[PDB]
């Protein structure tokens, strides 16, 4: 793969996307979930006492570039999953870019959901204002300051399991074979440490289901999570029924549905009919959109697997275009 190019693996039905990262000297390969909603790089380690037997664990003793650190860390994600441990320093190779002396977080403890998932840890791609430990420079910060990328951007392509899966992240560039037409520039609000954008409106056919709302681009979230009123409005347009747990039951037959269209900075971006269904279990389908009690939307994989995004940390801003498919 080209310089800074990281091929991704699509886990299950577009649940998450992970890539291989080499840490240490000589180094081990780790499968990390690439998360634009967080800013900590943590990995399962041999200091962990409740980690999965299937996870690959970082072993300080086997890295000649390991450097001890006296600080501890703890994190808790949006769904309550958590992990904790100690800080360390080592080299990280991201698509051939060798970041020297990156602060890495070794887990001593992790939630059962991490122990049973496909990840060895997470790579945070949010802004450095939300690292859990103050003074920690994120991998993007280090790629820029070490001169490993000449433009402070990363291009993101998330594939659809229905089309073969895959995905690809490119640090320092983007790939126009993955999208169609012209990219639309959208300003980013990073005041809360996330990639925040404003959606002008949302329509289903001729119906305006929502007026302008703010949301965050989160590759680490599976669904499109909307504020309660907006979610209900969307659900009514598709005849979806509320499961009372933040999810909806929708018809498995999407052949009759119109796309969920977002108007962003004057252009149209959509959630295609097929993406309206997340998963099918014993003939019942769970929708690709859900609800949460926040005033902003979490624009997750349901949306990102339909739209290519170029993330620019420098401005900050994003460039979006419909996926080529």
């Amino acid at each position: 793969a080209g310089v800074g190019t990281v091929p991704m693996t699509d886990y299950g039905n577009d649940i998450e996307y992970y890539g291989q990262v080499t840490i240490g000297t000589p180094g081990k390969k780790f499968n990390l979930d690439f998360d634009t909603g967080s800013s900590d790089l943590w990995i399962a380690s041999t200091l962990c006492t409740n980690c999965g037997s299937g996870q690959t664990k970082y072993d300080p003793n086997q890295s000649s570039t390991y450097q001890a650190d006296g600080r501890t860390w703890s994190i808790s994600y949006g769904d309550g999953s958590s992990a904790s441990g100690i800080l360390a320093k080592d080299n990280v190779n991201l698509g051939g870019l060798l970041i020297k002396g990156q602060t890495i977080e070794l887990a001593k403890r992790e939630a059962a959901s991490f122990a049973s998932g496909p990840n060895d840890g997470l790579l945070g791609l949010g802004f450095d204002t939300i690292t859990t430990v103050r003074g920690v420079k994120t991998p993007m910060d280090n790629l820029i300051s070490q001169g490993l990328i000449s433009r402070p951007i990363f291009g993101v392509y998330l594939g659809k399991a229905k089309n073969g899966g895959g995905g690809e992240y490119i640090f320092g560039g983007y790939d126009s074979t993955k999208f169609k037409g012209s990219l639309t520039t959208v300003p980013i609000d990073n005041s809360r440490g996330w990639w925040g954008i404003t959606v002008d409106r949302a329509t289903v056919g001729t119906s305006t289901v929502a007026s302008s709302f703010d949301g965050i681009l989160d590759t680490g979230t599976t669904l499109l999570i909307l504020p309660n009123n907006i979610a209900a409005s969307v659900a009514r347009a598709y005849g979806a029924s509320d499961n009372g747990d933040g999810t909806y039951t929708i018809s498995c037959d999407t052949s009759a549905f119109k796309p969920l269209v977002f108007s962003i900075n004057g252009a149209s971006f959509q959630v295609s009919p097929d993406s309206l269904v997340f998963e099918e279990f014993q003939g019942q389908c769970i929708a690709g959109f859900g609800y949460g009690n926040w005033g902003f939307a979490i624009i997750g994989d349901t949306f990102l697997k339909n739209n290519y995004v170029v993330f620019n940390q420098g401005v900050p801003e994003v460039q979006i275009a419909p996926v080529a498919e």
Binding site: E16, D33, D40, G78, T219, G220, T221, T222, G300
Partner: peptide, 5 residues
Amino acid sequence: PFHXV
């Protein structure tokens, strides 16, 4: 589903 902070 997952909900990454």
